[PDB]
């Protein structure tokens, strides 16, 4: 009911040599860089607001606790972006990034489009370390702006720290993205029409991602394909700790789960990216 | 309407705290059952008990937990006194050697308003009785004699027991810090 | 920062005598009828699937665990509706409903529209007990069908057990309601343009409700009213156990919180409904 | 011309110890449970439509009056199924079912297949009361689904209330079953090839049952057996109130009539089921 | 909800001048000839069997009482056909047939196909009285046999008295016609594909007729025509005494009811047939 | 890749279970730290420990918890043996009267695949030593002598200790029920 690493490796080679595989990277892809995930940000937001980190986490979801932080005082969200910039894109986080085996194995492949939901320059920065060049596309002016003819376009689906208006962190920013009208939303839905995705380091907890794959399956069911042909194009979801309910919800949406070895989380991902090559 | 809620399932703790803090109109009463963690330190157990009771009732809550550290047992039970009195009822006077009967009766309140937990600890020196004497009170009161006094907590009335017990010094601190 | 019962009582009399107050009832309004809430359904779904109820609740949200139940076997969702009808609308639940002080105090007021998110006939059934007559509107055929000129219209926002196609319980049904195209969705958004709502027994955990009040705030901010006039029309949210984060999120959306006495949850609501009269 | 209880008792012991006797239960088997038969449903359908119950019964047969009810308004048939579930499978109908002597005597025998034409869980529910386990088979997904190695299979020939698509009540649903293509129709015609049936509480008024035993006689007459061998395998029809015409029509179809005592209808059936043991 | 005579008269002229209207005549078309209907046959079958006519009618339907008559004695059905030939096609019934205004008005129109379910030569015999010639088609040898280039074909749907093997009167004969394999069954279903029918003197009580118009509606619903185009081709059902349930069942099957004046049943039909001319 | 993961923070339990179940390629090892609830019943504590460790690591997990029920203390510590050996190190031989030294060493495995928890309990009769003797082993092994034997768990090697200890009968039951 769940693919292993050796079973999913020839399925990822076929989609990559056709140029129809696109990585979708999450917050967990920057964990060997000693960066906070969605839980240690809330531990840092509770320290500023005067909460205890265990008591503050019981007052709502991740989207709702950041909305409470941004309206506690004026210019409180701007300060967070400044602090995050100092800690996510620091010089010691760049030094851990050349010697990271995942970021070397990601940049060794010749991708054309990479989607990320992280606030750091460590995905396109891994491409600059391997001699390649990337193109960060986060806002409307980036898509309209000039780029080289053949460059891996890194689509910042959540925003970038150098453009603080594009960051979706609070609940009102996620509700603004429910209309699927943003330029990262329009680019994702057109690439999902024709390409397989590889989810690495991302867990389907945001309802803005789960709603896009819902309405792609709707176009699939109304097109009245057979049992054989509607199950042909799959997506892949590499996760060390997938439960029992969530892999069966995603079988509806043509998303296969790749079970990685949870003992060393960094080396299990690196062996997946080297098996595509 | 109340603003602070004292959570206990023990109906003997409830009529003690209503004997002194009963006249305060700002204090309500709830009876949610929580599960304590396994540790002998009173500060650790009462602090993890308040977050487990705020999670149950979702209002500003006050919880209470005790300790009966004994010198002959190197501080045991500590905050593990609830399953000792269940197991060793009055044999607890006999498992301890005669001659080194000294002990401490500790008690802690912790109030959690939802964003911070504050612990108030009082403490009463005493000694374990040679045998269980006394009828009043409740759990382990027939075995504990405070320092200077000759009688147990069970042999004293509710006004006399609260002039020795840790709760009698915790009423005034809880009323002052919460404005009850 | 939070209204009490005596403070919010003259504010509810003014909106009621103008005919601009509409109750929004949740699952908690049927708790004195000894009915399961959203937690005891999951304890019953885990017993059928072979899970332990504490282990099954850690594999996702309420929307996602019901989606996992409905796809475990064919005709598994239909059986649940049949079982729910035997336990929610039973004869012993009707007998507890005439002697319930909340259902007497609700039907004593002369309402015109009541919104509910519960799967039971105990809100309109309370109106039949007081001699009044109601009109259940859940599907498109109910809105098109005939009705008395002046009858309290009970809008089943989540569906009714006698029309099992209207029930939104699984995650795919909540994503179908994100487009705000259903007849309960279109009727709610037009009544929110002109009326105050009174939330009783409902906790803002569904993202389909929180997204409607978000977009209402958009129409409000783009209309460029002042500080005084954009804060004039409020909504009211009676809750025994509101935390510290959630009342401040709803101040953005013109929703005031009424703190009820949590010692007796049944009598605190009944004193609110009698204070409107 | 009609068997009595003592005459038919050794004929039923022989077919039961060979494992070739199958009960066919009707609506009359649930009459000690104080449930409506086919006449009190029409009295309840006339009350909803605004008819008098004596005037409504003269406008057509039972199949035709239910077809008129289902097309009077949208979602009118789904309301009936919900109402039927509240009254047929209620808790007070289950309490009358353990102390019923027919349901105790039915579950005391070790059957393998039971056919029923009633919409209630009181035939398989009688088997659960005696410690045994049953398997309700009503739709195509039930036959395909998993069951245990040896479990009495209860074939809902008319449908079940927890699967409202399987209920045949209106005239268009009986005409859909004339093609004999439904999974209860295909299972019945193959069991009729090799087994004796015992009709209890059912009267041959539906033309979908009388047409199956007609075609069985065709296979029998075209096979050109003798007078002795074509009359060897009989079926049994226990009825308190059989007339003068209907027992002679069924002698064509190898169906024998067992005359039960009409004074106490409940005890006459219970003495038949205890005489098989 | 029911057409009158003046409303349905231009609708019948349009289908007749296109040659797409076919009469379907019943037993009631021979009532001015003083012939028994389906009720006075049962009064005559009860006299032979020794029953009282009121007691014999309570033991089953018309199909079932004739099945009981045919198996009471050997050669009992062949006696009835001989008796019916003496009374239906007698000389005094022919003398009432030239002076009958319905049979004159039927033969005045230039039909091409007439379906009848009666056992008498008074429909084709009315055509011989007007100088026209007819062709009785009842069995397989009649369809294979020779006819003239253009002659109104009278299809005896129930059989004819001069071919006693074609008569469907008993219940086993109606069950033999359920397979729709007889040459009157195959000819009717192909003419129903392209023509409007006019039901005169027939009441939809036989389940072999109601099942044919059921399956025609199937071909119609699976072809996925619109609301406008699936309701274009109608059938017409002239009846003096249609109730309240039966006209609404037939609206499903594109059958319109023409209410005739019940004071004089003979003259109301004759004014309908003269309004087509 | 493994399919079952044995979670412990105690590095002496890890080299015991790798001595016997170490050759199984289907068993991995994790070190997440969990907090036990306060109860003397071993069945209650090991069952609430497995759900607290599945919540941490989110893979099919196997946890382990022990008990040292003593007759002189009416079953105390029970599953509370972790803070006794911290407090009473070798005075635990002296707080118990000579003449009624009998005790039970209990031990429980609980594996949770994410939808069901199954508990395997073994048990060894014994008696508390008059003084702590022996060097090998770890916590409370110098004080426990099994029935029939004269030596402690600390005085025996790892192969000899597992022919008496509860884990030596729990290897075979865990291997059979999980197919390791
Ligand atoms: N600048 C950043 O990197 C950053 C940090 C915190 C939050 N955020 C934003 O807030 C959102 C919430 O973050 P989240 O972490 O809670 O959810 P998430 O879905 O983005 O990350 C969780 C996933 O990371 C995976 N993961 C954890 N450790 C890993 C490892 N060592 N190697 C590979 N994968 C690993 C988990 O298995 C899990 O599937 C994020 O999506 C992001 O938009 C960004
Ligand atoms: N037929 C039903 O009544 C029923 C039962 C379970 C679930 N559901 C559906 O699933 C959803 C989830 O249910 P849920 O209960 O978890 O969410 P919910 O928001 O509808 O109910 C929670 C609210 O009920 C309130 N409440 C609890 N007890 C109360 C009392 N005695 N008096 C007044 N209010 C009380 C809580 O304070 C809380 O604000 C529901 O919204 C519903 O659509 C319906
Ligand atoms: N849930 C239900 O039980 C239920 C109720 C009403 C209708 N229905 C459905 O509608 C159909 C209507 O058919 P119907 O009920 O008119 O005729 P039926 O053939 O189903 O039942 C009539 C038979 O019940 C027998 N009967 C009556 N009382 C009895 C008793 N006390 N003990 C034993 N037998 C007794 C009669 O002798 C008679 O032979 C039913 O066949 C059924 O499919 C089901
Ligand atoms: N040789 C015959 O004519 C004859 C006689 C009796 C029975 N049968 C056969 O048995 C079947 C049952 O006969 P049935 O009469 O009960 O059913 P039927 O449907 O054939 O006839 C009933 C119809 O005759 C109509 N009718 C009655 N009087 C009429 C009149 N004066 N003018 C015009 N229409 C009139 C009724 O309104 C009613 O719609 C018949 O269909 C037939 O096959 C044939
Ligand atoms: O002053 C005291 N005089 C005599 N006995 C006391 C006292 N104070 C606590 N005790 C007893 C009661 C209980 O048996 C144990 C505390 O354990 P503890 O967990 O707090 O009791 P509990 O679970 O029954 O109630 P609660 O829900 O408030 O935690 O020691
Ligand atoms: O066979 C044994 N021989 C000697 N000592 C033992 C044994 N078995 C457990 N012990 C000790 C170790 C620990 O001090 C206590 C168990 O308590 P326990 O909570 O399980 O230990 P732990 O917290 O250090 O590790 P873990 O993360 O697996 O729970 O008794
Ligand atoms: Zn406690
Ligand atoms: Zn531990």
TrEMBL record, chains A, C, D, E:
Pfam families, alphabetized: SIR2_2 (PF13289)
InterPro entries in the record: DHS-like_NAD/FAD-binding_dom
Protein name per UniProt: NAD-dependent protein deacetylase
Organism of origin: Archangium gephyra
UniProtKB/TrEMBL annotation, chains B, F:
Keywords (A to Z) from UniProt: Hydrolase, Nucleotide metabolism
Source superkingdom: Bacteria
Protein's GO biological process: nucleoside triphosphate catabolic process; nucleotide metabolic process
Pfam family of the protein (one): Ham1p_like
Gene Ontology terms: cellular component: cytoplasm
An example Gene Ontology molecular-function term: nucleoside triphosphate diphosphatase activity
PANTHER family: INOSINE TRIPHOSPHATE PYROPHOSPHATASE, INOSINE TRIPHOSPHATE PYROPHOSPHATASE/HAM1 PROTEIN
Family: Belongs to the HAM1 NTPase family.
Protein name, UniProt field: XTP/dITP diphosphohydrolase
Organism: Archangium gephyra
């Amino acid at each position: 009911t769940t693919l292993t690493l050796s079973e999913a490796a020839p399925l990822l080679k076929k989609e990559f040599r056709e140029g129809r595989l696109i990585p979708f990277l999450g917050a967990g892809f920057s964990k060997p860089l000693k960066l906070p995930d969605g839980s240690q940000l809330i531990a840092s937001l509770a320290k500023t607001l005067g909460f205890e980190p265990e008591l503050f986490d019981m007052h709502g979801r991740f989207e709702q606790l950041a909305e409470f932080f941004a309206i506690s005082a004026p210019n409180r969200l701007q300060r967070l972006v400044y602090e995050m910039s100092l800690s996510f894109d620091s010089a010691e986080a760049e030094a851990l990034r050349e010697k990271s085996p995942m970021h070397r194995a990601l940049a060794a492949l010749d991708w054309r489009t990479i989607y990320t939901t992280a606030y750091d320059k460590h995905v396109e920065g891994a491409l600059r370390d391997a001699g390649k060049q990337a193109a960060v596309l986060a806002s409307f002016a980036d898509f309209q702006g000039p780029r080289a003819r053949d460059v891996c376009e890194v689509i910042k689906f959540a925003g970038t720290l150098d453009q603080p208006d594009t960051i979706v962190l609070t609940e009102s920013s996620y509700f603004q993205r429910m209309a699927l009208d943003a330029p990262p939303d329009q680019r994702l839905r057109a690439d999902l029409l024709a390409n397989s995705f590889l989810f690495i380091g991302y867990s389907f907890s945001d309802t803005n991602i789960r709603y896009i794959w819902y309405r792609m399956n709707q176009l699939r069911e109304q097109s009245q394909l057979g049992v054989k042909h509607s199950q042909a194009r799959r997506c892949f979801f590499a996760t060390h700790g997938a439960g029992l309910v969530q892999p069966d919800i995603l079988q509806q949406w043509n998303i296969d789960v790749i079970q990685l070895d949870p003992t060393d989380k960094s080396a299990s991902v690196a062996r997946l990216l080297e098996s595509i090559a | 309407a109340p603003t602070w809620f004292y959570n206990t399932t023990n109906s003997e703790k409830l009529r003690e705290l209503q004997h002194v803090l009963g006249g305060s109109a700002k204090l309500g009463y709830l009876t949610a059952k929580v599960t304590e963690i396994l540790d002998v330190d009173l500060e650790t157990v009462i602090r993890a008990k308040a977050i487990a009771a705020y999670r149950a009732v979702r209002v500003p809550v006050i919880v209470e937990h005790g300790a009966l550290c004994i010198d002959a047992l190197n501080g045991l039970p500590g905050a593990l006194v609830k399953p000792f009195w269940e197991s060793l009822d009055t044999r607890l006077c006999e498992v301890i050697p005669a001659g080194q009967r000294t002990a401490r009766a500790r008690g802690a309140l912790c109030y959690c308003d939802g964003r911070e937990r504050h612990v108030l600890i009082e403490e009463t020196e005493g000694e374990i009785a040679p045998s269980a004497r006394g009828t009043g009170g409740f759990h382990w009161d027939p075995i504990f004699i405070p320092k200077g006094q000759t009688r147990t907590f069970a042999e004293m009335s509710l006004d006399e027991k609260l002039s020795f017990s840790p709760l009698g010094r915790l009423h005034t601190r809880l009323r002052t810090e919460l404005g009850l």
